[PDB]
Symmetry: C3
Subunit: 231 residues, 3 copies
């Protein structure tokens, strides 16, 4: 484990995702509202999945070597197995908050799968220049997601209860800022141009992951928007 | 790329799926009917997924070598990753058109997963004679799907609006004819008996894919069956 | 095939899953109740999936070698591909029986995916002591599932029709007893401590699989709880 300088950030990430999972699990014990139960189930699964994948990276299972640039490059593939399941769950939290229609939910989840799937292909591609073709396709899929979150959901939240509109607006802004950083870290990190070393890259993804999952969840599950209007 | 004679058909397929995706995306911009939005989302995702997998084959990522018959045989595995997601989406288009019940939808999607999954196992199997055992199981799963589309959905469409009944009947006939060709191309192509060479096999799958996805989508999204009855 | 002593139990399992699939398929022909159709579709898919994965193990495709303990250990990975899809389908049978809320269904299916996913990682892990870390995480996920089936569903079934309450109680008890045996067989078998040899381990999993899928299905599909109350 300790033979890799980035191990400290993988261990911290593992701990923070595990602690986040347990807090949400305990906090959700005393909840019977069927609407609130939906948000607790979605939001608790997110850091639980991330916990297992951070642990796999810490123990060395989620790491492979990819030859490109005449070098064997360490690629943590477990990140994409994490994101494949956690990013659509996070979008479902937002879509259920605004009572989005089914067709829009399917478009979001499908574009998200394309985003993560093409990012994985780009991470494992051995022809250096082709890695950035996949990065560009994946980034186009992300821009579609961000467009929908702004010019489809925002207008839908305003016609909703005030507390669900204000909570959505906050979580929307958090998501757009944090998610946009991921393609940048990829491009300048060891998967892309190799400007930033792997140990610093790992620290950046850990800060982003914890903020986008645990921080996101703390804002959502403390809001009254997750409960139905009741007397 | 150009070192493979089949590259021209992979490049054409990539272009036609990309163009198809963009047309459906633009055409769906001016749509607010929640029913129509469902069909546009399903139908636009189909060629978008196929685009990415054709590109992976063009660039050489979606290709592996499988030893059988005393030879290293080029097997494009990316086809099955495509079909795993696009064939159930196409069946969902048909099932939603006739307002099929949930139990029937699950049976269709499950049989479809078995069809594609066993076809993938057959494509990667190293014992030559066993490849055709998997082909037979996969073909049995397809025949179940075709039976349901005829002796379960057809009777359901007649009790529906006339425009949804006539549109379903057309898309049903297109699907049964085109899908039935796939097991035949597999059997006589490089995955099976090896009668037809890979470059011709690739041309045939490209014609079938574009027809079953883009051609299918053009018929559906030009129909009024996708809109609810409104004044 | 016959070069492996466990082949006899893989062949028996294949036959019993295939026969089970055909019986459920025939029995479900004469069913039009939309509620009953749901249970028949879920319950017939379970042994059909298991059939294909037992066949892959029989023919040698679903087997790999994992080095640990200074030895190349035969690991049947196809079991986890089976369980990944069949265990959530079995939980869906139970959840639909008691009309569970959506949030609870998602929590069950998500915990089940974590259970199977971490068990697969543990089966393929090359550092011997780490294999049991994954076993423990997977077992914690199972205990969560069992808790929900007892202290969330049981109370919900009592407020239901008497026949659905008594049928659920029976299937609940069958599930908790049979599922609990799996982590024990893993721990003492070739994936874990290696006390029980592989051929005996394979026999035990076959008895458990057939009972948990075909036996489970025979109890459910003979009950009147799967039909709506009708005159
Ligand atoms: C009902 O809706 C509320 C349940 O949602 C919340 C239910 C959760 C979604 C269930 C998923 C958690 C499982 C219990 C998994 C247990 C293993 C975890 C990875 C444990 C990690 C923390 C600890 C080991 C440090
Ligand atoms: C509606 C939305 C959900 C739609 C989703 C969008 C999606 C279509 C976007 C594209 C996804 C696609 C790129 C997934 C590729 C997975 C692949 C990286 C797995 C590893 O295989 C890659 C190479 C080794 O580098 O295999 C070496 C050769 C091996 C012999 C490969 C044989 C196994 C194949 C991988 C079998 C295909 C399985 C499916 C891809 C499983 C789904 C994986 C997940 C990442 C989507
Ligand atoms: C709301 O419902 C309508 C949206 O459906 C339609 C929405 C679509 C389903 C969203 C999926 C498309 C994404 C925007 C993916 C973008 C990358 C594409 C693969 C681009 C391919 C064409 C071009 C690069 C040649
Ligand atoms: C309700 C419906 C959706 C049900 C679906 C029906 C489905 C059950 C039908 C059978 C599907 C099954 C054959 C999928 C097999 C995937 C497999 C080809 C992936 C590549 O692995 C094959 C060998 C190399 O040749 O791995 C070499 C050895 C490696 C060490 C393998 C270890 C990884 C395992 C593959 C882990 C299992 C992952 C799941 C199979 C992922 C789903 C893939 C998709 C193709 C279903
Ligand atoms: C409508 O709801 C009822 C259909 O459910 C029941 C429908 C089933 C869920 C459909 C799935 C079965 C498919 C027909 C697959 C056929 C291949 C099987 C694996 C055959 C195995 C048995 C035989 C080959 C020994
Ligand atoms: C809501 C719920 C459904 C959530 C589900 C819970 C889930 C997150 C729990 C953890 C699942 C995770 C451990 C799955 C790992 C699959 C992995 C074993 C496949 C084989 O790859 C392992 C190594 C060889 O030993 O690959 C060698 C290196 C290769 C180069 C690997 C590159 C391919 C990657 C495997 C791509 C990721 C694909 C996804 C993991 C596909 C889903 C598989 C299924 C088992 C979940
Ligand atoms: C909890 C994890 C989250 C919210 C991860 C989000 C990840 C992304 C938005 C990743 C995007 C990428 C691109 C847009 C292209 C480059 C490759 C990716 C996958 C890093
Ligand atoms: C857009 C792609 C489509 C509609 C693909 C359809 C593919 C099939 C219907 C494939 C069927 C197969 C068999 C029936 C057995 C032989 C292997 C397959 C997977 C080619
Ligand atoms: C039809 C198959 C069924 C119902 C299989 C159930 C399997 C389990 C409940 C497996 C559980 C495991 C653990 C709890 C940890 C050890 C590894 C597993 C996956 C065997
Ligand atoms: C979206 C965030 C990207 C900003 C990356 C900042 C990295 C600064 C760290 C110093 C770079 C290390 C280079 C010298 C080793
Ligand atoms: C009462 C609110 C705080 C509860 C404690 C939460 C502990 C989980 C770890 C959170 C750290 C990361 C927060 C986002 C920066
Ligand atoms: C379902 C369509 C299958 C028909 C295949 C027709 C192939 C004819 C092309 C000529 C065969 C090439 C053999 C000589 C190289
Ligand atoms: C107005 C209808 C035609 C629009 C142009 C569609 C261009 C997408 C490519 C379609 C070619 C394949 C059609 C099926 C044979
Ligand atoms: C949950 C069931 C686990 C019980 C396992 C009993 C196995 C007894 C078979 C004899 C053990 C073989 C050891 C000598 C070869
Ligand atoms: C009339 C009920 C029996 C029908 C025959 C079922 C045959 C399928 C194989 C069942 C054997 C396994 C039963 C569970 C132990
Ligand atoms: C194995 C991959 C299957 C999933 C394909 C994605 C489409 C799923 C459609 C689900 C239809 C709704 C069923 C109720
Ligand atoms: C990782 C594979 C999980 C999918 C298994 C297929 C069954 C899914 C059941 C979904 C139940 C409906 C939830 C609302
Ligand atoms: C185009 C939709 C408007 C909202 C999206 C904001 C774009 C942020 C740019 C992200 C940069 C990634 C490289
Ligand atoms: C048996 C259901 C009737 C409709 C299915 C038509 C069968 C077409 C044969 C396809 C040939 C594939 C080898
Ligand atoms: C803790 C929830 C109560 C019901 C679960 C029964 C636990 C059975 C123990 C299984 C042993 C697996 C190692
Ligand atoms: C080795 C660098 C080659 C540059 C390729 C950049 C491709 C980016 C595509 C974005 C449209
Ligand atoms: C090398 C050819 C061996 C023939 C096997 C055919 C199997 C087909 C099974 C269809 C029932
Ligand atoms: C080689 C045996 C090492 C023992 C590790 C046991 C780990 C079990 C963790 C359960 C909390
Ligand atoms: C609940 C605390 C979980 C912390 C265990 C993971 C941290 C790795 C320490 C080496
Ligand atoms: C929108 C046009 C997309 C065409 C790019 C793919 C074709 C491959 C050319 C080499
Ligand atoms: C319907 C009977 C299915 C039996 C075939 C599988 C058994 C393997 C025999 C070698
Ligand atoms: C993106 C930063 C999240 C901050 C988490 C703190 C929330 C406390 C209510
Ligand atoms: C299967 C052939 C499809 C033909 C596509 C043309 C549709 C234009 C309306
Ligand atoms: C767990 C044992 C199941 C027994 C199956 C027999 C059911 C006949 C109704
Ligand atoms: C009005 C809410 C502002 C939230 C933005 C937070 C950016 C990290
Ligand atoms: C909408 C604000 C985008 C912020 C992008 C930050 C990328 C590091
Ligand atoms: C009555 C519609 C006929 C459609 C069949 C088209 C076959 C390619
Ligand atoms: C229902 C007509 C089937 C046509 C099969 C064509 C196979 C090449
Ligand atoms: C295995 C075939 C079953 C025969 C019919 C059983 C009575 C519905
Ligand atoms: C009251 C029903 C008892 C069922 C338990 C069966 C254990 C195999
Ligand atoms: C609730 C009874 C548990 C039985 C466990 C059996 C494990 C072999």
């Amino acid at each position: 484990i300790t033979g890799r300088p980035e191990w400290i950030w993988l261990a911290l990430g593992t701990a923070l995702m595990g602690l986040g999972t347990l807090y949400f699990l305990v906090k959700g014990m005393g909840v019977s509202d069927p609407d609130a139960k939906k948000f607790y189930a979605i939001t608790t699964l997110v850091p639980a999945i991330a916990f297992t994948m951070y642990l796999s990276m810490l123990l060395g299972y989620g790491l492979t070597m990819v030859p490109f640039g005449g070098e064997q490059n360490p690629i943590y593939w477990a990140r994409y197995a994490d994101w494949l399941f956690t990013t659509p769950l996070l979008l479902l939290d937002l879509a259920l908050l605004v009572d989005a229609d089914q067709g829009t939910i399917l478009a979001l989840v499908g574009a998200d799968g394309i985003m993560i799937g093409t990012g994985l292909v780009g991470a494992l591609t051995k022809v250096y220049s082709y890695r950035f073709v996949w990065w560009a396709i994946s980034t186009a899929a992300m821009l579609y997601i961000l467009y929908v979150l702004f010019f489809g959901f925002t207008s839908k939240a305003e016609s909703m209860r005030p507390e669900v509109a204000s909570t959505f607006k906050v979580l929307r802004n958090v998501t757009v800022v944090l998610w946009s950083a991921y393609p940048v870290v990829w491009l300048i990190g060891s998967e892309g141009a190799g400007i930033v070393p792997l140990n610093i890259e790992t620290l950046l993804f850990m800060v982003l992951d914890v903020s986008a999952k645990v921080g996101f969840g703390l804002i959502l599950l403390r809001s009254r928007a997750i409960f139905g209007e009741a007397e």
